[PDB]
Ligand binder design. Structure first.
Ligand code: 9EE
Ligand code: 9EE
Lengths: 262, 262
């Protein structure tokens, strides 16, 4: 509807099926989503993990060059500009095939990249074979009047990763993902916990449908700091649009002890 | 019912109202529970936080001497013996009023204390004024064919505390608690997450009803490693009896990085 009294940030999440190794098609889909999100008055669009090339880690590593990643990145910056909306995307990193990870980046409505992050927790043997894990903590930055951060997919399943973002001041954690296999406890159990245990909002944007030998769950969701869904999708493609409203675990935690016990 | 094929541990949880500063009454209640649990073939009974003196931290600190704590402890060891069942209880620690914390201890069916733990995360100003926080990680020990551990109440709300137990090999985490205020997201959201994110079982034993200026939630529960309740109580007093059946987060986690980011 209309932007409410008492909300100063409206976000959008893209849920859709990508075609493996067809970035012209996948980027066209993000362009359409960015246009529809901007038309609904969203200021930011979050898109799923590796969407541009499809979630096909072994085939990315074998077939997708650094020049082809750079061209998709350049076009995504163009979409943020031409559609006038901040965009979070996830591509392979910019290094060579054997040296790059899986990334997430935030570009503003001018097409400038404000923040970049390399996925720390790679999932399973195919990712671990195709990508190098990140070594840096998630970034946190002011945008639209809140502290935003980025994490990718499996990352958010580790309470430590979200705690790292929140400990640096994050209020809204944006998470491109690619979750298949009817893993209902991730959105159902883990994500609400991450939100509650840190007093933060998390946005989780998944693929859906048949893609790269898997069938993705959909279930994209924005979870508020009480653990409740501010909005959620089912299994079908969709554009989720949400207005964010305007125990103190982060202070009580004995971090110095905890760091020695992990 | 009968002990099932495929289960070699049956546990019991006591949910009840304590009377503040009346350990003869409160220990009589634990004695009754221990008798009923043992009659149902349970090998261990878990009881709630500070049950013996009631959950009244400021009044414990002001009125309950080290000799009176020691006498209750001695009697609880007697109950484990006389009723022939392992018992987990939670009392003030054995030091002076100004030096003690909140503890949990496990005694075997012979009345010998196998493990002791001092609550690390104290909750709110009254606890923090009445008790000294623990400084040690949770203990983990073989008993009944599994690795058992202990945590207390608020502790379990910190993913780091349960991760510490699981990283030392815990399979079943036993948690005396005192949760009031209709805090449904603790049993509803956090506990299932703790179980899933570590692949462990957690038993959570609460007070219920009117006690010490609060009304306790009940909602005692045993949560399995899929995050599902193996058994649970509502708001009324009860004895919950459960048979325990016979992503690899603990291996994937980049603990060395995580320890620097908390
Ligand atoms: N792209 C990913 O990180 C997939 C995460 C799957 C995690 C899970 N728990 O099944
Ligand atoms: N005895 C306790 O540790 C009370 C925990 C209350 C925690 C909560 N989240 O409200």
């Amino acid at each position: 509807g209309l932007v409410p009294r008492g909300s100063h940030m409206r976000i959008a999440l893209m849920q859709h099926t990508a075609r493996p190794l067809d970035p012209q098609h996948n980027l066209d889909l993000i362009d359409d989503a960015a246009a529809r999100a901007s038309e609904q008055g969203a200021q930011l669009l979050l898109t799923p993990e590796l969407f541009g090339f499809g979630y096909v880690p072994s085939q990315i590593c074998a077939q997708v060059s650094a020049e082809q990643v750079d061209a998709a990145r350049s076009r995504l910056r163009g979409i943020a500009r031409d559609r006038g909306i901040a965009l979070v995307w996830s591509l392979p990193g910019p290094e060579g095939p054997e040296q790059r990870g899986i990334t997430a980046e935030l570009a503003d409505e001018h097409g400038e990249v404000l923040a970049s992050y390399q996925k720390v927790q790679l999932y399973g043997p195919e990712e671990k074979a195709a990508f190098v894990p990140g070594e840096q903590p998630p970034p946190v930055l002011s945008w639209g009047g809140r502290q935003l951060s980025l994490l990718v997919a499996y990352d958010v399943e580790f309470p430590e990763m979200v705690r790292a973002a929140a400990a640096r001041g994050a209020q809204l954690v944006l998470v491109p993902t690619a979750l298949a296999g009817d893993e209902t406890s991730v959105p159902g159990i883990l994500l609400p916990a991450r939100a509650v245990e840190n007093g933060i909002t998390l946005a989780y944007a998944n693929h859906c449908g048949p893609e790269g030998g898997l069938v993705f769950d959909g279930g994209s969701v924005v979870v508020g700091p009480a653990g409740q869904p501010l909005g959620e999708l089912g299994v079908e493609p969709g554009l989720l649009v949400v207005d964010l409203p305007d125990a103190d675990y982060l202070q009580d935690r004995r971090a110095e002890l905890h760091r020695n016990w992990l």
